[PDB]
Design a protein around this ligand. Sequence first.
Ligand SMILES: N[C@@H]1CCN2c3c(F)cc4c(=O)c(C(=O)O)cn(C5CC5)c4c3C=CC[C@H]12
Ligand SMILES: N[C@@H]1CCN2c3c(F)cc4c(=O)c(C(=O)O)cn(C5CC5)c4c3C=CC[C@H]12
Ligand SMILES: [Mg+2]
Ligand SMILES: [Mg+2]
Ligand SMILES: [Mg+2]
Ligand SMILES: [Mg+2]
Ligand SMILES: [Mg+2]
Ligand SMILES: [Mg+2]
Lengths: 482, 482, 208, 210
Amino acid sequence: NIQNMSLEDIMGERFGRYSKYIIQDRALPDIRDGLKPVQRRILYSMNKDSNTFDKSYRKSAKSVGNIMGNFHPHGDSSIYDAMVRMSQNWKNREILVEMHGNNGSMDGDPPAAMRYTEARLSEIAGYLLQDIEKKTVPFAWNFDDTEKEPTVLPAAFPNLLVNGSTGISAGYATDIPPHNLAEVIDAAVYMIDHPTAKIDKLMEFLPGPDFPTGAIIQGRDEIKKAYETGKGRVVVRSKTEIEKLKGGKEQIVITEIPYEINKANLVKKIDDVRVNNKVAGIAEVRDESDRDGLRIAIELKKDANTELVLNYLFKYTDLQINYNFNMVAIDNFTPRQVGIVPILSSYIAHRREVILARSRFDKEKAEKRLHIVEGLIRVISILDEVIALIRASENKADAKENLKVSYDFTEEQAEAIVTLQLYRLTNTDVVVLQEEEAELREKIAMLAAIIGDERTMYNLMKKELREVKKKFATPRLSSLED
Amino acid sequence: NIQNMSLEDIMGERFGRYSKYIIQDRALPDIRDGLKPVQRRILYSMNKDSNTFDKSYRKSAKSVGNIMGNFHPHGDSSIYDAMVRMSQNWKNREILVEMHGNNGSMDGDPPAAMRYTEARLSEIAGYLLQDIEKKTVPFAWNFDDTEKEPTVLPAAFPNLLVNGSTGISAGYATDIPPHNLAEVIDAAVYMIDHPTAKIDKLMEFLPGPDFPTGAIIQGRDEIKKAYETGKGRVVVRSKTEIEKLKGGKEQIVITEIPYEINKANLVKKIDDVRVNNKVAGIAEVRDESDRDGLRIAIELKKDANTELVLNYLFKYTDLQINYNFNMVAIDNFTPRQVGIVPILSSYIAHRREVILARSRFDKEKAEKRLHIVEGLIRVISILDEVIALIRASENKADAKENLKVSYDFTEEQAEAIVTLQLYRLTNTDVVVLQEEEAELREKIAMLAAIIGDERTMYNLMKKELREVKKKFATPRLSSLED
Amino acid sequence: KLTPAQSKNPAKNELYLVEGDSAGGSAKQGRDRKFQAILPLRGKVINTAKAKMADILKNEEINTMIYTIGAGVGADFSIEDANYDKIIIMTDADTDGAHIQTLLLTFFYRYMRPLVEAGHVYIALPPLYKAYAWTDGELEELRKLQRYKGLGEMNADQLWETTMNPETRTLIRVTIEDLARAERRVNVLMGDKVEPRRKWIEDNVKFT
Amino acid sequence: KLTPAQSKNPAKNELYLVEGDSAGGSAKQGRDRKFQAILPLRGKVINTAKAKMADILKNEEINTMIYTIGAGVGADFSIEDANYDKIIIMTDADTDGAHIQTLLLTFFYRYMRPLVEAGHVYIALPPLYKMAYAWTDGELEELRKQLQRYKGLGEMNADQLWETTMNPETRTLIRVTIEDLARAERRVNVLMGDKVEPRRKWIEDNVKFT
DNA sequence: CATGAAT
DNA sequence: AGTCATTCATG
DNA sequence: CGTGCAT
DNA sequence: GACTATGCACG
Ligand SMILES: N[C@@H]1CCN2c3c(F)cc4c(=O)c(C(=O)O)cn(C5CC5)c4c3C=CC[C@H]12
Ligand SMILES: N[C@@H]1CCN2c3c(F)cc4c(=O)c(C(=O)O)cn(C5CC5)c4c3C=CC[C@H]12
Ligand SMILES: [Mg+2]
Ligand SMILES: [Mg+2]
Ligand SMILES: [Mg+2]
Ligand SMILES: [Mg+2]
Ligand SMILES: [Mg+2]
Ligand SMILES: [Mg+2]
């Protein structure tokens, strides 16, 4: 009825369990797909349930509950919150979930409850899943042990850098800023050609973070420190403009603010400066933002030092802040502080495994089919004899042994023939079969080449990454300075 | 840009719109299956999803989310709350949902939240859904116009009386108590035989309600009144016993309390009597209910008038309460107050429709095949020339045309023939086919008779009902007095 | 409780009474903050024809309306000291939406008649389908569909253009036509007595 | 907050500290009213090794264990005045359950050493499996000869709870004993204390990510 | 005042 | 993850 | 302090 | 249907 345990030998076991789990399978991203497990489950699940960009929106609660019943044994609210975030275009550079309804705002206010909103995968997230049906990625069992789920996704683009991550575990934490899709691909593509590229050359392609919120990034030197070691301190400052007004008064207008900053609160803290007369000359603060543009008007008084006021807001509010790179991620089951190079290499590494796996899958499919198509071509020239032979057989199995023995068809061919539907005896035309045979041969040749030549496989990897760039590429939002 | 409307008119369209909906489509049960639309959707969805008594439990949230996305466009909470209720065996005489996890108690504490619990349909619930897949009940479109849902269930047992309903709308409310499954069926069977049965006779079989919480129901006169008009007021009193304790003191011991009564709040209120000394004599009040028994000891003082106390608790607490029949259900899309008679009429009429519909469905299947099976028997008599015609035909279309024209096969046979797999040509056995022809002919005769003879049909109804009773029948819990 | 307009202006300023926090939030986003305030109604509004004026006044939704409109209640009610030119009841195009419009209206008639008889109380008409259509009639005419289950799944861009934009919006004006035919109507549908309501329901509701 | 035992008796009575309300509800239902109390811990418990004694005395749960066990906190802690001779920690078998235990223990250690050291602080071992019941994958496969994977406490039904974990007869129960004051002070600070570096180290040294 | 589907 | 209020009819 | 997956 | 407080690491 009892059994004693040491307080040491027990906090040891208990905490080690929580430690490991919350590090591997909760708070930190996989280095290759750039996803935390919950994020991966949401994606994999919605995809299985056919809830994609090309098809209707699906009531959010339906997706959440399915995720919870099949893959993620945790709170409906955690799952939804995660799902909501993936859909906010001020947190993700490239949103992975599109959502109908109130999904929040930069004012930090709450999204509509899960019963109100509809959602589906964005078109680009589909590229995170591309080729999953093709045995291209290691699966594992879910908690039920009733269904298999992916441990990583195929990632047809480098999501760790593009969307970022953040990031609180046990003993480790992670902060990775978002990046411009095209810049990241341009980098990756270069490194494919140049395995030993060094940070400086890579920075000619990937100059730095690109925040969805825009604004100005200052600190080339630190960006490099970050891209090199995983840590770095950089300055983000809001995008401002000065409008002149009637009555000789000038006015500061804010149009982009720093990533991860709450517009509503920022506005209060600025108005708080005015209230407390901490700097001389602020008339009134107004959030003038509306459904299609961010705009904070800070109207000054007549005869007021406009540069004085702007410098104070930068120093003493969040009009300007420090972003801290702390790029940690999960590489070979372990938390690892990493810079631009282990990241991109790990990605290329992974995209290689996927493409090869894919091509093996497709080759096998094509071989099998070619094999059947070869037999069907033969069968046509002996159509009548084959019918006669089947008529002469006692049952299906006997028909096959007859087909083999008498015409040297193979099991797989004989089964194919014997299970043809009668009406097929009317499409007796060799030439289209001979055209399929040819397409099939070519296809196999192309895949064998991928499989048996690293240069050919990387060239595929480059063709493909460039297609993704052409398709989803967009302009920088954040500008740089040193 | 702006249209005026009268307050009298605006309040008209609004209240009519809502009144009609909350009456027809929310608060009041259909008179045949006894369900409110929310409950039907719960059962139909879980059933569609194969979440049934014979298979693992699903996470409640998976179920809830599916219901919400396909059928019932409302609170995930209301849906869950409804689903939880159909699983509490102290609210439903015969529960339709089995739930793993904290789903409540008679103490009326909250059930575990949707994220914790697991559910599946009960075996009996399956009987409410029986034959749903055989086009036995009218379907409509869901709020989406994307999927058809059933409007009433086949109801292989008279759920409306067995389980009850309750019951708040606009202009109308409902209170129908639960009854013993065996008694209800006995009456329905008697009425099948004697359509014109009088309430007095029916009550020889269905003597009154049977609460799942047992207790004592007093009022034969009013039970009758209620079964005649749908309204009546009855008394429900707790099962009690007197236990003599060590030297002089007695103990009132409660073992069954009135339906819809919260054990915890009762025990409190009985103790509040002791604390206020409204009546003299109470020493202590002890809820002693464990996990497998209900027991409330009311320990009395020495020389305490134990009738005086028991009478006072009966009057001024819920140790005894009045239950009010107000049986209103939906019959022909309309609210309707009804007694025991029209209720069983409706049930029986309904089961008639179901059994008719069901038999038409099975008969159409047996026929479609018997038709194909006839054709195949013919083909064997002329295999060589039928193969020859397909050989000679231009395509599937043409082949079918020639089969019709040259040998008088019908589209449906021509389609069967032409889509046979080649290995079928091996067979020459007409006997097996002839055996199947015979079994099919017999089956159609039996089905045709049900469809064409009111009596044959009704004996089926009776037979099936009796099977339901033999299987699910359970003893009375509530005793009757006058 | 409420999200207010930026400038105080009893001549343009509008109050939007929105059914639910869900829509309450989509309106905050969709609106024009200069002259448009949002006041969420979280839950079914109390019935001011049935409840004791004791409770009627101890009610959060009811207090923050008397106090957000700033004219006071009953006859202590000064239309001249109002806070909004318009008062807009924006609910879901469902039945409970209808029901909420119904409870609000009886409160504005029972306790701020000046407002209803002055034509300041309006009711928003959200679209039912997506061009946009409001009637199953103007739909198939638009067939030359995204059925809105509620204001929830509409997006601020859409909500503005379709129903909050003073230049693009349809908007019902509530107007007392016959004072006496109006008091009878309200008191039957919303009053303490059940039987006449039932009667009304039978006489007027077509179950088919 | 707390569901009390029907009869005071600082000699038999037990305190069940349960992770979350759902399982706290099932515990209310499954218990033996006469001597078993339930105190639901709703949410993750404050870290008494990291946080400032100010915030600590202001933490709802902490205050309602001190004022429930009725012996005050710290060196002002009178063992002889405890209300239960058995304080039982009942968590899910998941990792966050393992976490809660970790946090509760560092509380009693830091603020009621007298209690842990008198062998009065316990941890309930619930069953992982049911096919009978099994507690460890090993004990499991032996029953597979001559499997409802309990996802957590809120999925067990009150009569099952009682039989496997709460019934003093049919239940397995860890007793938390201190064996090395100093070696069990070092282990608590590495793991639960302000400084992050030592903890990061300990993980790298002791956790096999394989 | 409590009931059970709804905001 | 429990809690708070309201509608609607009925005794 | 605030972040985001967890209780 | 929003709200309340914890863990965890990091400036
Ligand atoms: N004005 C009311 C204060 C308490 N309250 C509830 C509530 F108590 C329960 C509930 C629920 O139980 C509940 C549910 O979905 O089951 C929903 N709500 C919200 C009205 C939408 C509730 C609300 C509404 C928000 C505020 C109001
Ligand atoms: N003792 C705490 C006071 C605040 N609080 C929360 C909470 F604020 C949020 C949440 C949540 O947001 C939340 C969620 O599912 O998202 C769950 N809980 C519960 C811990 C289980 C929360 C709890 C826990 C109950 C009481 C505690
Ligand atoms: Mg939460
Ligand atoms: Mg700053
Ligand atoms: Mg609720
Ligand atoms: Mg009574
Ligand atoms: Mg609605
Ligand atoms: Mg858990």
